[PDB]
Structures are given as structure tokens and as C-alpha cells.
Design a protein around this ligand. Structure first.
Ligand SMILES: Nc1ncnc2c1ccn2[C@@H]1O[C@H](CO)[C@@H](O)[C@H]1O
Length: 327
């Protein structure tokens, strides 16, 4: 292991601002070489509860590391190519107490947005962490609830998500398994069209000025050459007992689909998450401009039709290739 200063030299540490959190740990934004990055910091291997939960072991965090690398690499592949995941810049194992400068950033977020986490100030100098440095992907869909232009933008977002998932199905037999709206990031792009390649066939998606990135592979599954990497939640109690959001039904519906066998490949889980996201677009997102052109009112009807038909498709690949929304 390395000190925090290896990943976060002084200027980079000084520029850290907290941008997100979960039970897992903390997410900061910083800048180096004029380019923003997101730094995800996860405590591992220790005996303390953190945010009310036990810390993962190194063996338990390896799947996320592996999957983050494989999905990042899809941006540079040929037959199955997409930029719709997030870039992975580096992964380090760090040892030390939490940097005071990160505690300062943590406090500022707590003061302004509020935190559900413990202040991470109780770690000793032998504590291990995994520090994942990603591309900065933009702002999550949940925080953009009231910020998008119109349902035209929603269509682009759903198309981008579907295409990315299809490319990952095709290359990696990938299932995200936790694609809630905090895990869909939106960044401005000057590109009018985005490009992907699925089993050697290239196509484009009108961007509506945004590039989508799918993040957070903590529950994800994939395989290469018959070796499966996944999170076995078969004995998890709490994952399947949520309520108050369709999100929590998706965990139950995944478990029904896979008979509680999480190592198997069930790409229908990607369709379930896409349905949950379409449902958010129609029910919880609110747009600056409502549909008032015949072209826009047709777009709304088409997204409604997607919502009521998409659960009859077997995978994100099937949706992309066969659904009328994308023709
Ligand atoms: N690579 C990234 N680029 C930008 N923001 C990121 C990431 C990764 C995570 N986040 C933000 O932190 C929240 C919790 O994962 C997410 O919901 C999200 O707000």
C-alpha cells in the first residue's frame, strides 16, 4: 500500500470537493492537468463499522475493480465499442488516517447538502482504503430532475443507456444490477451524434447536447472465457425489503428472474433497470419545456409506448436492435 499523498499530492488534495456518498464511502471531485476527475474512496479490511455497515475485504472489492476496468476498456475496443460507461484512470490501495483536507471537504458538504455518513475521522494510520480515480462523468440524473430541456433529451438518454448496456451484454455478458438514477451521469457535449459499435456494426445516436455515463459497478456481473465476476447477494436480507420507490421492486424482480442464482447471466435485469429509468423519465423528471410541437408530442407517445412494451424484450441488445423507439 501507498500513502494518500501518492494519489492525492498536495495541489490535487487542496482542490478536492465532496460530490457524493453512500454507505460504501465517499466521492470527491478534483482536478489535475486541467481536467476534472472523480475520486471514490472505500475503507477496506478493518473491524470498524463505517456508515453502519462492515467494511469489505480486498476479495470483496475486487469485483468492482475488475468490472470498472473492463467497462472502461470498451471505449477503445473495435467490434463492441462504447463510451457510455465511465473511464477508469487508476486504482490504488492506500494506508493511513483520513487526510485532514478531505475531512474539511467532507464537512463543507455536510454543512451545505447534509450527509447520512459518519464523519470519516476515526481511522487509524494502519487503515486500508481502495482509491479509484475515474473520469468525471457530469451530474446524476436524480440531481437533474428539474434541469433538462424536454422529453427529446429523455429519448437520447434512454437510447444512450440502452446502447451501452447492449454493447456490454455482447462483449462481457454484463448486467449492471443497480442502475438507479444516481448512477446515470449527464455531461454537456458539443458532439451532435455519439458513436457505438455492436458486434461490428457501427451506428450513431443524436446527443441532444448530452453524453451519458453509467457508473457504480458494486452489484454488477460479467464474464470472460467462462470466468464470472459478480456480487453474490443471495443471502442479503435488506436488499430485497425496500419500499417507497420502484427502485426497490427492481431488486425483487431481479431475484424472481434469476431464482436467487446471481452467478447466472440474466440480461433481462438490464431491461428491468431500463424500465425503471423510463418510469422515472415519465413520472418524476420534470422538463423546462413540455411537448408542444407535433414532433415532440409524438416523442412523448413513443416513450410511453416504450414503457408499456419494453418488459417484453429479453435484453438491452433485443431492445436496441428491435424496439421501434430506436428506428
Ligand atoms: N465518475 C463520477 N463522476 C461524477 N460523479 C460521480 C462519479 C462517481 C460517483 N459520482 C457521484 O457520487 C454519487 C454516489 O456514487 C453519484 O450518484 C454521483 O453524484
Amino acid at each position: 500500500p501507498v500513502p494518500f499523498s501518492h494519489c492525492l499530492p498536495t495541489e490535487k488534495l487542496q482542490r478536492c470537493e465532496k460530490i457524493g456518498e453512500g454507505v460504501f464511502g465517499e466521492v470527491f471531485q478534483t482536478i489535475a492537468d486541467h481536467t476534472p476527475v472523480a475520486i471514490k474512496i472505500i475503507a477496506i479490511e478493518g473491524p470498524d463499522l463505517v456508515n453502519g455497515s462492515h467494511q469489505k475485504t480486498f476479495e470483496e472489492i475486487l469485483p468492482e475493480i475488475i468490472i470498472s476496468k473492463e467497462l472502461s476498456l470498451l471505449s477503445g475496443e473495435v467490434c463492441n465499442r462504447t463510451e457510455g460507461f465511465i473511464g477508469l484512470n487508476s486504482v490504488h490501495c492506500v494506508q493511513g488516517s483520513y487526510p485532514p483536507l478531505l475531512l474539511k471537504a467532507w464537512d463543507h458538504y455536510n454543512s451545505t447538502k447534509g450527509s447520512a455518513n459518519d464523519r470519516p475521522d476515526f481511522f487509524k494510520d494502519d487503515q486500508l482504503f481502495i482509491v479509484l480515480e475515474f473520469e468525471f462523468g457530469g451530474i446524476d440524473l436524480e440531481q437533474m430532475r428539474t434541469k433538462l430541456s424536454s422529453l427529446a433529451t429523455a429519448k437520447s438518454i434512454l437510447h444512450q443507456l440502452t446502447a451501452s448496456l447492449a454493447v456490454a451484454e455482447a462483449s462481457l455478458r454484463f448486467e449492471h444490477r443497480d442502475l438507479h438514477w444516481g448512477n446515470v451521469l449527464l455531461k454537456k457535449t458539443s458532439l451532435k451524434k455519439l458513436h457505438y459499435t455492436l458486434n461490428g456494426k457501427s451506428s450513431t445516436i443524436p446527443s441532444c447536447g448530452l453524453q451519458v455515463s453509467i457508473i457504480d459497478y458494486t452489484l454488477s456481473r460479467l464474464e470472460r472465457d467462462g470466468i464470472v465476476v459478480f456480487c453474490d447477494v443471495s443471502m442479503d436480507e435488506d436488499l430485497f425489503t425496500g419500499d417507497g420507490d420502484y427502485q426497490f421492486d427492481i431488486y425483487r424482480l431481479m431475484k424472481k428472474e434469476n431464482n436467487n442464482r446471481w452467478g447466472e447471466y440474466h440480461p433481462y435485469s438490464n431491461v428491468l433497470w431500463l424500465h425503471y429509468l423510463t418510469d422515472k423519465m415519465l413520472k418524476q423528471m420534470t422538463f423546462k419545456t413540455k411537448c408542444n410541437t407535433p414532433a415532440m408530442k409524438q416523442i412523448k407517445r413513443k416513450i410511453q409506448e416504450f414503457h408499456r412494451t419494453m418488459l417484453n424484450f429479453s435484453s438491452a441488445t433485443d431492445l436496441l436492435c428491435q424496439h421501434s423507439l430506436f428506428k
